[PDB]
Structure 1
Amino acid sequence: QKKALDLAFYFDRRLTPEWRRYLSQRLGLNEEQIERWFRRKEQQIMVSKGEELFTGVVPILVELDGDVNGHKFSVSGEGEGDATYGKLTLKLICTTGKLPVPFPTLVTTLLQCFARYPDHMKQHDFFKSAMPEGYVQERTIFFKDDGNYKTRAEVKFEGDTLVNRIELKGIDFKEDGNILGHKLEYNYNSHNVYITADKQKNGIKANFKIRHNIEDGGVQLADHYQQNTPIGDGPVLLPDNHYLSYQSKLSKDPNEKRDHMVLLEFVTAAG
């Protein structure tokens, strides 16, 4: 009755059919009850681990390799994430010269592991649970009446640092359109992103529309379709339906002559 369950867990958390049956017949407890106890303890540990890895300020490195209608560019970033306050701070610099797209179209692409999940729903935070091996984030971004972005991001710890390498491809863009023609305002609205579980891929998915302000009136729609998949083998947290509430501020560094964006975001989960 209990007690030995702790010991069993300490010995071996790989609840295989054989380990389950063994513990069943050996404790009188039935298999489902053992399954439930194990999954429960696993969750609590998954929660405590994520809290540990994301306590305090976490240094961030970002590398984005881009190609939009053959126009190639690189963007590198650094800054920090403070999940306690749902705070993400980044300075992103285009290193190849002039960014051929407007920076706000890259805002969604440029680390949801930094969201502030309230205590009562920390067991729904997939993004942290994937650490340190990380997760792959893929998105397709459809700009209405214009082309599309496809992105592939790999978010993981490399040592003490949270790293994000991204590859981006954009095709079918209008050279005189809102994107390649630089007709979008340098600002950002608040949005809610709805997260659901992607169980057949052991992760999560989301879709959401960003509204970009066209200069002197009008909106450029950007329709986002997103999928996240764990990279490693460990257990992860699969969330019930919830959402992330975003605020973003875009600014500049007065001393940085290179084409760049300063990004501040606050992210809080549906609690």
Structure 2
Amino acid sequence: SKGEELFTGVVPILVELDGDVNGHKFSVSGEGEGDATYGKLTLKFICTTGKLPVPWPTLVTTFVQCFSRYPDHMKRHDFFKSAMPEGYVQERTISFKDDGNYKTRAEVKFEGDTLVNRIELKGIDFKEDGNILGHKLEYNYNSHNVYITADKQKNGIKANFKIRHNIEDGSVQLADHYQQNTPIGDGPVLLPDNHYLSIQSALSKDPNEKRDHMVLLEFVTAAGITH
């Protein structure tokens, strides 16, 4: 198909986010590349407004599921690539248990040969010295499964899933995710059977970088369908 063929090689990625969490306004710019053949992502993010006012891990899911590796026998279930190049809207509510919430609206699409993720993020209801605004989350990331379903009247997909962020005392901060994607363009898009994405994510720092930043290496395989 048109859209899948755009991903057979290494694709440059740009991420741009504007955020407001409890009145803390901030922006992040990221760059890197994806190789969907291997389900592989590398991205470096820099907070361009100074210190990021929330923990970096909390923004990982918001900062391009078109880079998931869909096995050949599952190609007919890959909504994300099918929407390309015109792209998709991706909306979420991320509910931090016993704390505030993020609501995100993003558009993921090509600009030339570069895959771009532009995001608006709004966070409200955060506790001033909860785990988020108090910066009590460890700089690491657990592996998760993302459960996707068709959303046919949207001509798209949905997902609800749980992210657990380790807290510095050894506990975990749950971040419930509810997600809806909608194609932007007029080409045919794939409405998948139920399946999941299996994700691992590793966070690191660039030893040479003194701006507030995050390096992310992530591998994603679609799974849960046999034929």
Per the normalisation by structure 2, the TM-score is 0.97
Larger Rg: 1 or 2? 1
1:182 pairs with one of 135, 141, 147: 135
What do the CA deviations read for 1:118-170 (whole angstroms, capped 9, x no partner)? 00011100000000000000000000110000000100001110011000000
Contact kept in structure 1, 2:15 and 2:30, CA below 8 Å:
yes
SS at match of 1:123: helix
Aligned to 2:171: 218
Q: Is the 8 A contact 2:149 2:195 kept in 1?
A: yes
- Equivalent-residue separation in structure 2 for 1:214 and 1:164 (angstroms): 28
| 3-state SS, counterpart of residue 153 of structure 2 | helix
Deviations 1:41-64 (A, max 9, x none): xxxxxxx32332111100011100
Contact residue 18 and residue 119 of structure 2 kept, 8 A: yes
**Cα contact 2:161–2:177 (8 A) shared by 1:** yes
Cα deviations by residue, 1:51-86 (Å, 9 ceiling, x for unpaired): 321111000111000100000000000000000000
Query: How does 1:36-185 map onto structure 2 within 5 Å?
Result: 48-185=1-138
Q: Any gaps of 5 or more consecutive residues in structure 2?
A: none
SS of corresponding position for 1:113: helix
TM-score (normalizing by structure 1): 0.82
> 2:160 and 2:188 mapped to 1: Cα distance?
24
Q: How far apart are 1:223 and its partner, in Å?
A: 0.4
Runs of 4+ residues over 6 Å off in structure 1:
none
Is 2:4–2:82's contact at 8 Å kept on the other side of the alignment? no
Whole-angstrom distance in 1 between the partners of 2:5 and 2:130: 46
Structure 2 counterpart SS, 1:240: coil
- Once residues 154 and 53 of structure 2 are traced to their aligned partners in structure 1, the CA distance between those partners, rounded to angstroms, is 34
Whole-angstrom distance in 1 between the partners of 2:96 and 2:169: 19
CA distance in 2, matches of 1:119, 1:232: 24
Q: Distance in 1 between matches of 2:85 and 2:137?
A: 37
- The structure with the largest helix share of the pair is 1
Tell whether the 8 Å contact from 2:3 to 2:85 is kept in structure 1 after alignment.
Answer: no
Asked whether the 8 Å contact 2:96–2:174 carries over to 1, the reply is yes
The secondary structure found in structure 2 opposite 1:104 is helix
Question: Tell me, which stretches of 5 or more residues in structure 1 are unaligned?
Answer: 1-47
SS of the residue corresponding to residue 79 of structure 1 reads strand
Instruction: Give % identity.
Output: 96
Give, in angstroms, the shift of residue 235 of structure 1: 1.1
Q: CA deviation at 1:104?
A: 0.2
Mapped to 1, the partners of 2:65 and 2:72 lie a distance apart of 17
